[PDB]
Design a protein around this ligand. Structure first.
Ligand SMILES: Nc1ncnc2c1ncn2[C@@H]1O[C@H](COP(=O)(O)O)[C@@H](OP(=O)(O)O)[C@H]1O
Ligand SMILES: Oc1ccc(/C=C/c2cc(O)cc(O)c2)cc1
Length: 289
């Protein structure tokens, strides 16, 4: 029915088959002014930063952060599956709501701009993203079968994956920085110095948290702890939807993991495409820490 189906176009972007229907519901979504959007290209650290922000908004209270599974606390806007949809769950949530999305800026519901909602756009280097997303498709049965790693990389590089080109996603979101309240963050900076990155989020949300709380947030949101937290590690989803025996959702949590899968030849070809796409932009991603 929806499982292992081909991607469908939605306003020019390839999309997970299940999510591509009744798209008008997404377009008409009603945001609230104090909604906080977490936006990322797939596999860029959405779940990671979702749990960070939840801790922040709950003043570092761990028991509060345990009130529900991640899909209820921080729903994915565009998700639909008979699981309650992301929008239905968002309609049930108290303000300030945290909203996760992978949508290109052009597909984000216009209400979010009209309400001046704050947004955190997190970006991750395209090499680790390709590898994370490949493995994700092995386990996430809503996605097309990715094929071999070599076939998948070619599709990733041409933007023939759900949510389209990493290049376009990152560059278009970056253009929206000057005109809207958006915090731009990088997965590699968060891995390298979570204290300083988390501090950037706390100031952006106009919050005031002491250093004891800050350390507890850092500890509670580290890969080692989150991987074994059943409220955030996606083991709560039906086996039919995500089969973690093919790849766990909390897979490696490393910057540089891409090196383990890219051949030198693949690397040189990637780099050439990357240069063509990205040389004119003032973004400098790190591929290792
Ligand atoms: N606490 C944490 N620290 C670092 N990376 C984390 C994390 N929690 C999740 N991730 C990583 O974020 C990626 C998934 O992102 P998203 O939530 O946007 O789908 C995965 O990368 P890997 O597949 O490289 O391990 C996942 O392991
Ligand atoms: O109940 C569910 C809750 C969430 C999900 C997430 C799906 C998903 C789909 C994508 O194309 C990209 C992605 O990064 C995640 C699926 C089922």
């Amino acid at each position: 029915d929806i499982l292992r189906k081909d991607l469908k176009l939605v306003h020019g972007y390839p999309m997970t088959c299940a999510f591509a229907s009744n798209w008008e519901k997404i377009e008409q979504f009603h945001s609230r002014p104090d909604d906080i959007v977490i936006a990322t290209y797939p596999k860029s650290g959405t779940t990671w930063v979702s749990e960070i922000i939840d801790m922040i908004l709950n003043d570092g209270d761990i028991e509060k952060c345990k009130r529900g599974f991640i899909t209820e606390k921080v729903p994915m806007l565009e998700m639909t599956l008979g699981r309650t949809s992301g929008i239905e769950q968002l309609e049930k949530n108290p303000s300030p709501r945290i909203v996760k999305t992978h949508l290109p800026t052009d597909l984000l519901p216009k209400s979010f701009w009209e309400n001046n909602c704050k947004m955190i756009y997190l970006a991750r280097n395209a090499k680790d993203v390709s590898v994370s997303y490949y493995h994700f498709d092995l386990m996430n049965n809503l996605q097309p079968f990715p094929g071999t790693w070599e076939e998948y990389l070619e599709k990733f590089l041409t933007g023939k994956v759900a949510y389209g080109s990493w290049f376009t996603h990152v560059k278009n979101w970056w253009k929206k920085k000057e005109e809207h309240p958006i915090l731009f963050l990088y997965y590699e900076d968060m891995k390298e110095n979570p204290k300083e990155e988390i501090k950037k989020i706390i100031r952006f949300l106009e919050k005031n948290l002491n250093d004891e709380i800050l350390d507890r947030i850092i500890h509670h949101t580290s890969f080692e702890v989150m991987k074994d937290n059943p409220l955030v590690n996606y083991t709560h989803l039906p086996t039919t939807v995500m089969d973690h025996s093919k790849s766990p959702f909390m897979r490696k949590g490393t910057a540089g993991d891409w090196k383990n899968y890219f051949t030198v030849a693949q690397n040189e070809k990637f780099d050439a495409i990357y240069e063509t796409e990205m040389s004119k932009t003032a973004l400098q991603f790190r591929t290792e820490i």
